Design a protein around this ligand. Structure first.
Ligand SMILES: [Zn+2]
Ligand SMILES: [Zn+2]
Ligand SMILES: [Zn+2]
Ligand SMILES: [Zn+2]
Lengths: 49, 44, 49, 147, 53, 53, 66, 56, 279, 56, 56
């Protein structure tokens, strides 16, 4: 009841981190039923921008 | 004097592992000591 | 000498855009060379054609 | 000025209208392919490496980095890298000495020429040697710039 | 160093200048855009009274 | 340099301070000068000191 | 940023006048248009810089480097 | 056309392979090769071929 | 035969020739002579800028899932029909052990370096009569510990046994045979920050612990049968040198360690206070 | 469509443009940098031997 | 490029201050205001091609 919950932690942490870093909205299975431009990089050329 | 690390002016003079977490500070990011070598500019 | 027609004049607010010419000037004569198709490579930074 | 071009006063440029800074960074770090001994940030000399560039490595220092505040031209290298492989018969085979380089140095971008400012090194997520430099450039307006 | 104002605005002493001739437009080197009156819609020069109307 | 203010600002803003030039004709251009590297007879030297006291 | 040296248009030195133009508005309670007039900037190409320059330098300066 | 096109030529029996200039190892240019797609597929083909013939 | 080509200027010939690369022109020139040698060079950095086979071996890995331009029932058919060659290769066992150690290392939240080192350690031996089974736990735990230790991440045997119980014996024999295999084919101070991390203390007790550990290491009193215990009581005497309540009754189950050993170390450092404090 | 019918080439340049009312139509203004990068071969004749010698 | 123009030949006058430079009358066949547009150059490499380029 202990050893597998840590790899469980790896799975959900990896999933959230992957989704936000990539922008594909789905787990690490080559992006089924997903959208692309969901997590763009912040634009910081100008405060107004 | 070779590294900075912080708001502290800890001149670490580092070779290897002399508490990179500098003694007066807490930091562990080790910024790197702007040179003494003479630089040239051009005020055109 | 005086100009004939009087002209408009005044202060106005501008701003400077990022598309500067020093990043768009590019030229190549006999440079590097692609591997799969044996052609001039791409890339303004990569000294392409 | 025909078709949206502009005449612009040279003297105002000289005084300092529309001047601007420009900050660029670079990222590099040691990579482990081991048999855990990784790359190194040293200063590559002539008889250590293979097919290294003509970047004239003099701007670096003993710890393989450049110092802040010096100027860099277009082709100056800023980071020194060396291959830690093993197994390649790394200084005993298929190369002379020319010790173990297979140099992976990072030259500056081929055109711009700034001044090295605020170089830091700190370990990455897992613990490596991980380097960021920054270079600073003045960009006076010229003919082709767009307002 | 020495320097002159032609190749940089550092070396200027000038800082401003003014220039005017025929404030009454007797030479007709211009004519005034207007919509009712040239005389009403333009301010008089400060250097008008130095010459007769 | 240590300040917030950037180095080429310090250069450029230095470059614009007007200087006393009554006797400018006495010396000659660095250009035309018989010397090399800023002799007293072609140039003058300035020094600045600051402290966060 | 500091006030500029040397108005871009005209060339008259500006930068001596900055803290003066400040204390014309701190204790003297003076209207600013008359403040620039009494400061003595009668052309307006010079006048725009003091009237529109913002001072980011102290907002930079409130860090604690080294 | 009997001299150029035959229906019994239209069934694959013996398969040509193309030389590495068609399918070059990209030589991954950090430390490795990262060797490429077509050669991966050909390795698959020859693996399934030998599996079938041993099974037969 | 050897098929090999060395460049040589046919008009200078004075050495293995001092030539240079004009990469922006894709040409090589005899720098002493100035004549071009060969032209149309091939790229060497943009190919990397465009975007582990050695750990996975000679056989080529394939992550095969489902696509987008096909029906879901046909993706299920693909998943059912893609499992027809999972028994011909030993690579099935190779990525099976790889998946297992992936689970174990990332459950132990280890670095990718440690994961790859364990992959290497298993790949190096990977098949021997010296292996001889051992329930795959002995060899996986041994390879993980060897790789993690040679990545200079020292982990305690109690933590390894808590993650995977390998009854502390076959694990030891497997560690010895991995040692011998790697020996043929060819750090106690690092334990302290993890324990003070688990206790939450600032840097100066860590530095004091390092100094006391090296000094007591230098002189005498191995004193304890794996002196990680007296390494711990170094922290215990450091925190008694300070005044923060980290009582040994708490510390014993905080570190899964004996309180009697703590008091014995307290005594053996009671009589040896002399040269253990720096300022 | 990307390697035969059209392709990358050599001997080319790319900048931005601005007007000029001091160039007649068949002329184009080129920066010295671009004209230093680009080139064009000439065959050595009796006619151009001296000029090409000087230019070398 | 859409129609027969926009591949037009020119003579070259080398100018300083890096950018291209062309007469205002030829602007509309190129269909190019100076809002930040960009052109392309193509240097011929032999006598035949120089001649037919200049004559057509
Ligand atoms: Zn510090
Ligand atoms: Zn002189
Ligand atoms: Zn002004
Ligand atoms: Zn030669």
């Amino acid at each position: 009841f202990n050893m597998k919950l840590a790899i469980n932690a790896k799975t959900i942490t990896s999933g959230l981190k992957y989704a936000l870093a990539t922008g594909n909205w789905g787990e690490q299975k080559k992006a089924m039923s997903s959208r692309a431009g969901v997590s763009q990089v912040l634009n910081r050329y100008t405060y107004s921008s | 004097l070779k590294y900075i690390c912080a708001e502290c002016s800890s001149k670490l003079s580092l070779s290897r592992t002399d508490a990179v977490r500098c003694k007066d500070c807490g930091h562990r990011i080790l910024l790197k000591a702007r040179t003494k070598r003479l630089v040239q500019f051009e005020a055109r | 000498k005086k100009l004939m027609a009087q002209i408009f004049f005044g202060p106005t607010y501008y701003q400077r855009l990022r598309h500067m010419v020093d990043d768009k000037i590019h030229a190549r004569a006999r440079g590097p060379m692609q591997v799969l198709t044996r052609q001039p490579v791409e890339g303004r930074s990569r000294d392409g054609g | 000025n025909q078709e949206d071009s502009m005449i612009m006063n040279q003297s105002s440029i000289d005084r300092g209208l529309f001047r601007s800074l420009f900050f660029r960074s670079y990222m590099d770090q040691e990579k482990k392919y081991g048999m855990s001994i990784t790359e190194t940030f040293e200063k590559p000399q002539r008889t250590n490496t293979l097919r290294m560039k003509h970047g004239t490595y003099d701007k670096l220092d003993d710890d393989g980095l450049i110092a802040p505040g010096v100027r860099v031209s277009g082709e100056d290298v800023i980071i020194g890298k060396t291959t830690p492989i093993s197994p390649d018969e790394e200084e005993l085979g298929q190369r002379t000495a020319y010790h173990s380089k297979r140099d992976a140095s990072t030259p500056l971008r081929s055109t711009e020429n700034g001044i090295v400012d605020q170089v830091l090194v700190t370990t990455n997520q897992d613990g490596l040697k991980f380097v960021k430099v920054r270079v600073r450039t003045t960009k006076i307006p010229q003919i082709g710039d767009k307002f | 160093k020495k320097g002159i104002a032609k190749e940089h605005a550092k070396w200027g002493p000038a800082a401003a200048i003014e220039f005017e001739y025929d404030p009454w437009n007797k030479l007709k080197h211009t004519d005034y855009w207007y919509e009712q009156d040239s005389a009403k819609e333009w301010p008089q020069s400060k250097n008008c009274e130095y010459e007769d109307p | 340099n240590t300040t917030v203010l950037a180095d080429e600002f310090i250069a450029h803003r230095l470059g614009l301070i007007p200087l006393q030039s009554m006797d400018i004709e006495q010396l000659e251009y660095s250009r035309d000068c018989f010397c090399e590297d800023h002799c007293d007879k072609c140039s003058v030297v300035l020094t600045l000191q600051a402290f966060g006291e | 940023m500091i006030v500029p040296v040397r108005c871009f248009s005209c060339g008259k030195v500006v930068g001596d006048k900055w803290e003066s133009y400040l204390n014309l508005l701190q204790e003297d309670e003076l209207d600013e248009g008359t403040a620039l007039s009494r400061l003595g900037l009668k052309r307006y190409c010079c006048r725009r810089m003091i009237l529109t320059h913002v001072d980011l330098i102290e907002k930079f300066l409130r860090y604690n480097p080294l | 056309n009997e001299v150029f096109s035959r229906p019994e030529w239209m069934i694959l029996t013996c398969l040509p392979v193309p030389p590495p200039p068609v399918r070059p190892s990209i030589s991954f240019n950090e430390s490795q090769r990262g060797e490429d797609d077509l050669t991966f597929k050909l390795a698959d083909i020859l693996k399934a071929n030998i599996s079938l013939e041993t099974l037969e | 035969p050897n098929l090999n080509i060395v460049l040589t200027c046919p008009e200078c010939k004075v050495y293995p020739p001092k030539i240079v690369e004009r990469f922006s022109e894709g040409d090589v020139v005899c720098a002493l002579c100035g004549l071009v040698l060969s032209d149309k060079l091939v790229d060497t950095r943009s190919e990397w800028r465009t975007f582990n086979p050695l750990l996975d071996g000679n056989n080529l890995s394939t992550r095969i899932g489902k696509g987008e331009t096909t029906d879901m029932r046909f993706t299920k058919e693909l998943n059912k029909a893609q499992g027809k060659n999972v028994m011909d290769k030993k690579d099935n066992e190779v990525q099976a052990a790889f998946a297992k150690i992936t689970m174990l290392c990332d459950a132990a939240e280890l670095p990718k370096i440690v994961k790859d080192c364990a992959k290497e350690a298993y790949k190096l031996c990977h098949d021997e009569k010296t292996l001889k089974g051992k329930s795959m736990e002995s060899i996986m735990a041994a390879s993980i510990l060897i790789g993690c230790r040679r990545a200079e991440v020292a982990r305690t045997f109690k933590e390894i046994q808590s993650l995977i119980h390998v009854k502390t014996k076959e694990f030891g024999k497997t560690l010895n045979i991995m040692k011998n295999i790697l020996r043929g084919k060819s750090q106690n101070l690092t334990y302290i920050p993890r324990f003070c991390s688990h206790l939450g203390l600032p840097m100066q007790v860590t530095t004091s612990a390092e100094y006391t550990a090296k000094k007591c290491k230098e002189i005498k009193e191995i004193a304890g049968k794996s002196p990680i215990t007296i390494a711990v009581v170094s922290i215990y005497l450091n925190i008694l040198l300070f005044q923060i309540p980290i009582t040994a009754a708490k510390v014993g189950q905080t570190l899964q360690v004996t309180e009697g050993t703590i008091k014995s170390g307290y005594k053996i450092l009671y009589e040896h206070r002399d040269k253990l404090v720096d300022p | 469509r990307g390697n035969l019918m059209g392709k990358r080439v050599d001997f080319s340049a790319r900048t931005v443009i601005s007007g000029d009312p001091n160039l007649e139509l068949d002329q184009v203004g080129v920066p010295k940098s671009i004209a230093k990068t680009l080139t064009y071969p000439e065959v050595v004749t009796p006619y151009n031997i001296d000029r090409l010698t000087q230019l070398v | 490029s859409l129609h027969k123009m926009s591949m037009m030949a020119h003579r070259v006058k080398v100018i300083p201050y890096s950018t291209f430079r062309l007469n205002l009358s030829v602007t509309s066949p190129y269909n190019a205001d100076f809002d930040g547009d960009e052109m392309n150059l193509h240097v011929p490499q032999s006598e035949e091609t120089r001649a037919e380029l200049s004559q057509l």
